[PDB]
Amino acid sequence: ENTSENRAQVAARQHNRKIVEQYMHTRGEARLKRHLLFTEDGVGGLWTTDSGQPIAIRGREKLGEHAVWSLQCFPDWVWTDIQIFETQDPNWFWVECRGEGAIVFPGYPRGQYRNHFLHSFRFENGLIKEQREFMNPCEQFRSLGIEVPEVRRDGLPS
Amino acid sequence: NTSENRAQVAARQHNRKIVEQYMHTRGEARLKRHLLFTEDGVGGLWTTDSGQPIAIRGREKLGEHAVWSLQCFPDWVWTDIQIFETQDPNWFWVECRGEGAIVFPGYPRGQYRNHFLHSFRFENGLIKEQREFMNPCEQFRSLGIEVPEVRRDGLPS
Numbered sequence: 286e287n288t289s290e291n292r293a294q295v296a297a298r299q300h301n302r303k304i305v306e307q308y309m310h311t312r313g314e315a316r317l318k319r320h321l322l323f324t325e326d327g328v329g330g331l332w333t334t335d336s337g338q339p340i341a342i343r344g345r346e347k348l349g350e351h352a353v354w355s356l357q358c359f360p361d362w363v364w365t366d367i368q369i370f371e372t373q374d375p376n377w378f379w380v381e382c383r384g385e386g387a388i389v390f391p392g393y394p395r396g397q398y399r400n401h402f403l404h405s406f407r408f409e410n411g412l413i414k415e416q417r418e419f420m421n422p423c424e425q426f427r428s429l430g431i432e433v434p435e436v437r438r439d440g441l442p443s
Numbered sequence: 444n445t446s447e448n449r450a451q452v453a454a455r456q457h458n459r460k461i462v463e464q465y466m467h468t469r470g471e472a473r474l475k476r477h478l479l480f481t482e483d484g485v486g487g488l489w490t491t492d493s494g495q496p497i498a499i500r501g502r503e504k505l506g507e508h509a510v511w512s513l514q515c516f517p518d519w520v521w522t523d524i525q526i527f528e529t530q531d532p533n534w535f536w537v538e539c540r541g542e543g544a545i546v547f548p549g550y551p552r553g554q555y556r557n558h559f560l561h562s563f564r565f566e567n568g569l570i571k572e573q574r575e576f577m578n579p580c581e582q583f584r585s586l587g588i589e590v591p592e593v594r595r596d597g598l599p600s
């Protein structure tokens with residue numbers, strides 16, 4: 286049905302999608318301003334870590350400081366194979382994509398890092414309130430020269 | 444009210460029920476979960492230590508994997524299930540938790556907990572591809588396997 290309430294939802298979903306698209310195409314020095322797409326109290330970060338706890342970055346200002354670190358450590362990062370998923374909630378989107386670039390973490394040799402990622406984007410008033418990324422930390426270990434633990438799966442059918 | 448979109452709403456509703464059934468399947472019912480798939484459907488784990496998926500291809504293989512899984516994860520339950528419809532009536536995502544005993548050959552019995560994203564793509568009202576994404580490090584912990592710690596110097600507070 287074409288009601289003003291359904292129309293508002295569509296508008297919201299369209300606006301929010303544009304921001305997800307912008308986020309995912311943000312490269313290079315533009316990364317230093319990606320925080321501006323967040324609410325003042327917005328949270329972003331990595332939900333799949335070796336420690337098992339997220340690295341959550343809280344607040345628009347913190348996100349901007351994190352961007353300085355990220356550009357140092359991932360100096361040429363690009364996201365590719367981007368698929369955006371709208372949901373039944375006009376303020377919640379998922380993205381499946383890959384990423385590749387140099388990895389330059391102190392205490393390790395410089396490497397080439399590739400991973401598969403899922404991102405969650407939740408919105409409030411047209412700005413991102415919570416962004417979360419999910420990847421396989423094992424692929425990061427490989428990029429850093431870190432031995433990847435191996436699980437034997439005995440009897441796993443063929 | 445347009446017949447195309449009526450078809451889509453219907454397919455999406457039907458598909459949502461199958462996703463719910465899958466996510467609520469527990470205990471011996473797990474041995475019949477393969478029935479929710481197309482004959483050539485694929486399921487499995489997309490986040491592995493090896494970097495390659497453990498993909499199980501076909502309804503019969505899927506049914507075999509379930510015997511294995513019931514041995515290895517005898518009491519597994521999904522919880523905190525959130526189902527996400529998408530713009531494709533045939534594609535859904537699920538965010539959830541899962542936990543249970545982990546009973547692998549050659550490792551001490553453990554208690555395994557992880558956070559999961561699942562992808563479900565449909566064809567003809569059955570699952571053509573299921574993929575699950577998790578953090579393998581939590582499965583290492585559960586088996587007593589040492590997990591390296593990545594240092595991130597400079598990482599701001």
Ligand SMILES: O=C1CCC[C@@H](C(=O)O)C1
Nearest residue numbers: 330331340355425595598
């Ligand atoms: O920018 C990111 C959040 C901090 C951890 C980083 C990582 O090690 O992948 C990614």
Ligand SMILES: O=C1CCC[C@@H](C(=O)O)C1
Nearest residue numbers: 331352355359362384418
């Ligand atoms: O996980 C990540 C890979 C490297 C770039 C990071 C970022 O600053 O977004 C995210």
Ligand SMILES: O=C1CCC[C@@H](C(=O)O)C1
Nearest residue numbers: 438487488497508512582
């Ligand atoms: O049922 C499953 C697919 C094969 C690997 C398993 C695991 O080791 O997590 C999960």
Ligand SMILES: O=C1CCC[C@@H](C(=O)O)C1
Nearest residue numbers: 488512516519541575577
């Ligand atoms: O990753 C998994 C943990 C144990 C159950 C397996 C399943 O139910 O498919 C999946």
